[PDB]
Symmetry: C4
Subunit: 182 residues, 4 copies
């Protein structure tokens, strides 16, 4: 209809500006599960299509960052795997890490996207240019985000956002070409 | 309709009284799976939104307790992570642990909520003020509970109950504010 | 309708005779997944409601057995957890293990139930009194079984069969009572 | 309708020619998840029905190969379990491995099937006789494949392709017979 075209255009205009995507970890890059053993070892589960999404953004000159409440070494191992250097762990209130990232990169609020699932993500989701909820996000986060993914956290929701941004900016071909050559 | 309004109000009136939520572990705080390796190590998988749910109740002055048949050290590690001190392990029949918790806290039956999935939860679900079934509960538990969650165990069902209670008591803002300041 | 009543009765008459349930492991007591690490350690994931199902059958005097192609020690650890002594590992063709179990127990073919998901289960599913497919079974197994569960393997499908058998035989109350007293 | 019959026949004619199935690993033989622990150990999860699918192809004289970007030892352990000798790891661009496999086997492009989920699979999916997308594949891969499975990667999608090929070639009975005799 007329309304879905308008809304689709307004979303595309937000995504056209994006120079950095920020992700939360648990519930967004993961399914939300914390796997714990009898000895207290911990694991999380990440999805390969999301890891490819982040690598495609970076191949296209779009920066990637993480801001998480998680503190464990699983996060460090995953960030190292993906070559993500801008990341912040143990952040219970996330506003201060966002402001630090903003200073580091020199970007306007509207040049960030942020994808979240729970209440501590809410102020970042409302502040940035493109605030995104995974489909399994808590009710307030689904309510107040600019957009929500079809897929759930850890199942390709972050890839869906990566592809939206690349497509909006006509960088999808650049990204895969650049990725495949490294 | 008239009937859904009445029922919604009756549920809210139960939730308004709640001073302690009691959870079962396997099938409720987890998906129900027991992951076992070749050496007999075991793991369970918990969900971060449920862990946040429990922390929000506690930030709002609502106590949390666990009563489980599980005996393994996974449970202890998770309870320590969440700062939950009232918990009972290896309880095959759960009535005696409930009565002990009741004595410890000094609460009326109707000031407890209990969220369960299987037959040993049934007498507790029927006795407390707000007896809750996860959506994947066995048929009798779904039948006799006061309410059932939309979500399944380990996927945010306990968070859905936490949010119902906080919302009923107008403590949702208090809870997130209090959480974010620690 | 008339037809669903007939079929429901014919299924109940099969279940009334059952003196032993036989389960396959991978895909039936599990989701089907084999979790493998970098060092070749392996895990499988079992569901607590299915473990309770098997314990309820045994509390009601119904025997339980496993016949599996799996050979790894995960299976032994799980059987020990559940107190299941009649079980057969590494059986690629399963007919010979079934005949051995039949000799051991002294039962007629029609006093066995068998729940399976893949082609090597087919001859057992067709031979026993109550041959059952998990809902995620391969197409031929769904086709030729007497009945299929609503739930998938490792998610409570075996419990659904346990409850059908107990209900048919009016042993559900006996079973939970007997379980809760040990 | 007339159109679904034509398309079903055209798909069957592709599958009749197949002398080798090539699979990707992560997202195709797995759910896509990478499970990572605090020490950097990694696991993936494979599905037993897919492992049986591959063994049935091989019992019927159809070769199996893997081409993956994954480099970790999980892959080697799984290939050894399944007796798959033709496989290629760490391939970021996959075209060169395909050409090497083609030389090794002496087959025409149209005698290969390939099942994929992400952009680096696309040129192989378009080149081979039967290019297949798992149902959870990224949008371009779903778009350009000859066929897509109903099931998702790691949940029996590869088995669904194995069964299509065996059925098209009237080798399903040969395959199970041959499997069950080893
Ligand atoms: Ca989160
Ligand atoms: Ca906004
Ligand atoms: Ca339970
Ligand atoms: Ca009640
Ligand atoms: Ca099986
Ligand atoms: Ca039969
Ligand atoms: Ca892949
Ligand atoms: Ca093609």
């Amino acid at each position: 209809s007329l309304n879905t075209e308008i809304e689709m255009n307004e979303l595309l205009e937000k995504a056209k500006k994006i120079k950095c995507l920020i992700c939360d970890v648990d519930g967004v890059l993961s399914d939300g599960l914390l796997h714990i053993d009898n000895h207290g070892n911990e694991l999380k589960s990440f999805h390969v299509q999301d890891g490819m999404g982040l690598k495609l953004l970076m191949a296209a000159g779009i920066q990637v960052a993480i801001i998480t409440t998680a503190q464990n070494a699983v996060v460090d191992h995953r960030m190292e795997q993906l070559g993500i250097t801008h990341y912040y762990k143990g952040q219970v209130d996330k506003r201060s890490a966002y402001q630090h990232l903003k200073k580091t990169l020199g970007l306007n609020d509207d040049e960030f996207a942020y994808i979240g699932d729970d209440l501590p993500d809410l102020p970042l989701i409302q502040q940035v240019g493109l605030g995104v909820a995974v489909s399994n996000a808590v009710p307030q986060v689904l309510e107040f985000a600019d957009w929500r993914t079809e897929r759930t956290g850890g199942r390709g929701a972050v890839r869906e956002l990566c592809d939206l941004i690349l497509n909006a900016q006509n960088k999808a071909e650049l990204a895969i070409t650049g990725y495949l050559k490294q």
